[PDB]
Amino acid sequence: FKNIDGYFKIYSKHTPLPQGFSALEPLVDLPIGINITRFQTLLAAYYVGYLQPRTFLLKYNENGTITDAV
């Protein structure tokens, strides 16, 4: 999940934290804009990692999918 000029993007994937690569296709984008400085969860165990502006080198394979990154 991320927010840029209010636009709220979501990406996800069904992977059946292990190794390997599995790029997250977007599913929804909410174009309204909320000033967000919190996060919660309603309903087990889960994981959380934050994001930084980090230049990446993406390896699109021949079928067009991100199969590896740097």
Binding site: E25, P26, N63, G64, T65
Partner: protein, 48 residues
Amino acid sequence: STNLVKNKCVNFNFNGLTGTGVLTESNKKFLPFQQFGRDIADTTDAVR
């Protein structure tokens, strides 16, 4: 909107972006969220 012509150099206009070239059936596997192929030179190589 007009009809679609393949195998001929045409002056196409998809969703407001102009261009010129031959349109063909592509086997590229666009994922449901992608609408454009792109070249090394930021040239639209394929479209939806």
